[PDB]
Design a protein around this ligand. Structure first.
Ligand code: COA
Ligand code: COA
Ligand code: NMY
Ligand code: NMY
Lengths: 265, 266
């Protein structure tokens, strides 16, 4: 009853994961079953399937609970400024909400982490250095982001037992969509620097809620569901977890058209 | 209401943690309260209290589920041998049973991890290399082990909200105790090599149960309780967690004498 890196790789190949793919994974490890090496079995299986020319990616985000202390302009009060732990791409943990896997991937020797804290991705493999390079600090889900590079690279996204609304790539569709009423987030971010802490104001479309009013919180799952229903994407089991595999460029264009059809002109 | 690295260091100083100390920590991080930097707040506070001359240590162990497959001699079935992930001191996770802190410390840049998988410790600070170097693979809780070095260096053990029965150092007292009937655990451990997996049999006194028959599972808690009752050690709050701080040499000698009184003949 032990799932192994060999058995999971066979499940991944049957689902459609291909040699040389850049694969981004959102996993609910508790639904995969008994794993011989725990969550690292999934990372090893993904690397075995894509090979040294492929890349394994996950959404890291940043564990930064100082967000509760900020005012309405997103500023940290001066009495708290020197206590907020600054962002270090090599030492800052991945956010706990994303699950154990993004942190397990981040601490795998050889994995790189991009510089935009809230929008940061981890990448391990051939194009990891390119995926994590030059992440724009403002609107880090847009044109120069790792998510845009995932579309650029013809990559794929694997929902490994995770609820479909956790597909981070659809925030990149939210960014691109020509629709009105886009919600905006502004927050002060501390950055670790060799000379001390450097504060910077960050502006981006708010990803803590749907980009526009009139949408349910988990509305991403409805887009993925309709994307599967249109005959695109693949569904199957990875271990014991019902999983979904989608093409990054196709789902992004679907999401952009989905938003621009319902909202705006 | 956010526990911070400055506030936790103040709690640690009030408990007795001193500049330059080598401190081994057993933590129940959920009891510390709301932390501004999560579990890393505790690690940063410990480093701030001991300073650059001090060292922060935790019991890492090893997350290795293949023990369920072993036969009656502790041997791995041949059809499973090449599938068991081998031990890598830099890549093998800390065991999940020990809590989030040992894994967070292990993955902090600057931390080293010793080579005995089941008994491995992590160390961060001045003596991290000395604490984790040349960990004997057999009887990895005895002579020349990181636990013996913690005693050698006059280090301390911090129970940060953790149950007193998780004090790993008392396994070093179990090893040293001159008592009969000591149970021995022997199991196959895979070691990572460039050429594949290298299997080795590991022999040690069994630390999954009391060293001798007739003892309760949490009997370590009884030793610390009696150790505190004798007027030794310090008690206090670290954040919101009731904590205990003890001298590594004192608790070890207390534990050895405790076992040699109940069991063993002069
Ligand atoms: C939130 C979410 C992760 C919860 O699902 P989950 O399976 O319960 O959480 P995890 O993915 O961390 O998997 C937990 C399993 O991993 C294993 N695990 C967790 N920590 C472990 C550790 N230190 N050591 C070994 N194994 C561990 C365990 O098997 C655990 O199962 P258990 O708690 O039942 O014993 C999932 O619903 C989800 O949304 N995933 C997508 C995340 C994402 O990418 N989000 C983007 C922003 S929304
Ligand atoms: C078993 C034991 C760890 C359980 O105590 P615990 O506090 O509930 O578990 P942890 O120490 O891992 O800390 C949990 C807290 O850490 C935080 N945490 C856990 N994972 C986190 C993550 N990825 N990111 C940020 N914070 C995290 C959370 O605050 C979590 O609280 P929550 O799970 O209620 O939300 C504790 O009782 C114990 O025995 N500690 C000593 C273990 C030891 O060293 N044993 C050696 C021989 S037995
Ligand atoms: N949900 C209501 C809103 O939540 C905000 O905080 C939210 C925010 O920190 C964080 O949101 C994070 C963002 O950061 C990150 N950049 C992308 C990520 N997908 C998103 O995640 C959130 O949206 C997903 C749906 N795609 C959900 O699956 C997920 O459970 C949820 N945490 O989770 C918190 C709660 O979801 C604010 N508190 C406030 O704007 C309002 O309360
Ligand atoms: N206790 C009963 C026995 O437990 C064994 O497994 C045990 C073993 O793998 C493992 O034991 C681990 C050892 O590894 C490790 N080298 C030191 C560590 N202190 C110890 O931990 C154990 O003993 C502590 C008390 N010091 C307890 O606080 C802790 O809850 C317990 N997990 O946890 C399991 C539960 O203790 C066997 N299943 C079987 O021989 C029998 O059931």
């Amino acid at each position: 009853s032990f799932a192994t890196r060999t058995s999971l790789a066979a499940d991944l190949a049957a689902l459609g994961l291909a040699w040389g793919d850049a694969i981004m994974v959102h996993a609910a490890v508790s639904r995969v079953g008994r794993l011989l090496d725990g969550p690292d079995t999934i990372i090893a299986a993904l690397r075995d399937t894509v090979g040294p020319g492929g890349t394994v990616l996950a959404y890291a985000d940043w564990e930064a609970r100082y967000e509760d202390l900020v005012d309405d302009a997103g500023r940290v009060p001066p009495e708290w400024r020197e206590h907020v732990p600054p962002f270090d791409p090599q030492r800052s943990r991945a956010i706990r909400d994303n699950g154990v896997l993004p942190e397990f991937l981040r601490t795998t020797p050889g994995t790189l982490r991009s510089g935009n804290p809230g929008a940061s991705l981890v990448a391990l493999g051939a194009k990891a250095e390119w995926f994590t390079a030059d992440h724009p600090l403002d609107y880090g889900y847009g044109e120069g982001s790792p998510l845009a590079k995932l579309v650029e690279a013809g990559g794929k996204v694997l929902m490994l037992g995770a609820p479909l609304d956790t597909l981070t790539l659809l925030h990149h569709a939210e960014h691109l969509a020509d629709i009105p009423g886009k919600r905006i987030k502004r927050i002060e971010v501390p950055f670790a620097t060799p000379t001390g802490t450097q504060w910077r104001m960050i502006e981006e479309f708010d990803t803590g809620d749907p980009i526009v009013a009139g949408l349910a919180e988990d509305y991403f799952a409805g887009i993925v569901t309709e994307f599967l229903a249109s005959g695109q994407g693949r569904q199957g089991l990875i271990g014991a977890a019902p999983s979904v595999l989608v093409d990054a460029a196709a789902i992004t264009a679907f999401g952009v058209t989905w938003l621009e059809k319902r909202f705006g002109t």
